[PDB]
Amino acid sequence: AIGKIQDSLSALGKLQDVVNHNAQALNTLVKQLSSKFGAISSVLN
Amino acid sequence: FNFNGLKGTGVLTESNKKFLPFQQFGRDIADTTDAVRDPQTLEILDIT
Numbered sequence: 001a002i003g004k005i006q007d008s009l010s011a012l013g014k015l016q017d018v019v020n021h022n023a024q025a026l027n028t029l030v031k032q033l034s035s036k037f038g039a040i041s042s043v044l045n
Numbered sequence: 046f047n048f049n050g051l052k053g054t055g056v057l058t059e060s061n062k063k064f065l066p067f068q069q070f071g072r073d074i075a076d077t078t079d080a081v082r083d084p085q086t087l088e089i090l091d092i093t
Binding site for chain 1: 052075076
């Protein structure tokens, strides 16, 4: 009965979701720097 | 550094990328320049 456990694996979506949620917030946070918000440009130099 | 207009900051190193024979500089994911070509010597340099 314990041996069958590997067959069911070879599930962890709850662990991948944690990784995805943070990766998505970091990808969005960086992308929000390319926005003009109604200014003449988006680059302070 | 400044490359024919392109203004930036970083360390320049020999690259191993291959541009197409009409492209001057490259950008990475999230749209930031990460490689340029020297107009004079035609060599690809990474920007770290």
